[model samples]
Target: FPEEVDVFTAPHWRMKQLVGLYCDKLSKTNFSNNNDFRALLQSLYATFKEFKMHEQIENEYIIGLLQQRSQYNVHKLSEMLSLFEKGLKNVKNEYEQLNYAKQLKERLEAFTRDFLPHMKEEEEVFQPMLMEYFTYEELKDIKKKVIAQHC
Candidate 1:
């Protein structure tokens, strides 16, 4: 049965919500292999690259999106924590280990800094613009292609 569709405050917000759920699931799970994680990240990178090229959306926004996607690719949060713990256990040279530690720290901090604000902006500014520019039927059509599900 088709469910009744109300006027959504922001339909794109649904996509954001799904992204958060997926990221959280990835963060809490453990992967059996790093190669699997790398492969997933590569796939996501490729998909995002195709998306950017197809849409012609070139800018720091795309860069930030790529970074965010890579960070959440496959249990990245857990992976980062594991890496840090391992680094702590085996420090061949204190300075080198510290550098490795600092790089992870910076990447994580940058991820948080970029994603949180970007999400909020999408909710506030972009969503409304999207609704205004695309009618309900148009959005539903696009959603079908992107999600391959009835919207």
Candidate 2:
């Protein structure tokens, strides 16, 4: 009775795949090559946008839904999410100003390091919590809202 709409697992897999792909493309990119850097910048921006929206959906929908019934401390999640935005901002500013590929690579590397673990924490913590507290239909419907927002 499910349509494979997962709260975390599949989405996390996709997130990791895209992040790895972008990191590779970003590494090979020469900062002096405006054409390559320009293309990578737009691509990276899209990736960051996706990352941000995912967090936004969790914050607004999932967290909000659970907070009503449980004393779930979502403050930490939002704080960590803000850090990602700051990290991306750092990368974006570097691309615009100095255009340093080395720094960009390092920043993204650091971001990936944190990002991977963050997903793990979410899977271990919230995924089970959601599974325990909500029905499949509820989870699927929430994901539908997420899909709608993305569209």
Candidate 3:
């Protein structure tokens, strides 16, 4: 297996680290200050958007090519994103309300609680498929297309 072709996972690590930084900031954040809390919340939402895009990049360049879909149903695939979507919307709607810091942290942290594990399942399943299904050079071709779009 060309460990090099697993560059796709790189973004996941970056995203996870970004969330940790957000949580770190949230720790010292002046929740009583709406602008400061809102600033961090917006950035957290931005990170979620980036993660959403990460899924798209994989779909277009990697997983969708892997025949995973022929086996996995639309319902099977749809479960993970909706929870985050709902929770994120919750943060936005009542973000300025009383005790929002707790809401914001618990809400955002709650969503990511499961999101991290989902990525693990993806790698466990698709990573092997890629190595077995495509040659190392072909993997490079796929990765190159990924770089063209993702970077």
**Winner by lDDT:** 2
Clash count for each candidate, listed in order shown: 0, 0, 0
Name the candidate, 2 or 3, with the larger lDDT value.
2
lDDT of 2 by residue, 69-109 (tens): 55534423344344434444554543453445555566677
Candidate 1, 50-116: lDDT as tens digits: 3333223212322233344433221033444455455445545645544554564465466556645
TM-score of each: 0.39, 0.72, 0.74
Clashing pairs in 2: none
- Candidate 3 has a TM-score of 0.74
Per-model lDDT: 0.42, 0.68, 0.65
Clashing pairs in 3: none
Q: For residue 82, what is the lDDT in candidate 2?
A: 49
User: How displaced is residue 109 in candidate 3, in Å?
Assistant: 1.9
lDDT of 2 at 128: 68
Query: Looking at model 1, how many pairs of residues clash?
Result: 0
Error of 3 at 10 (Å): 1.6
Give the range of the ten consecutive residues with the poorest summed lDDT in model 2. Answer: 75-84
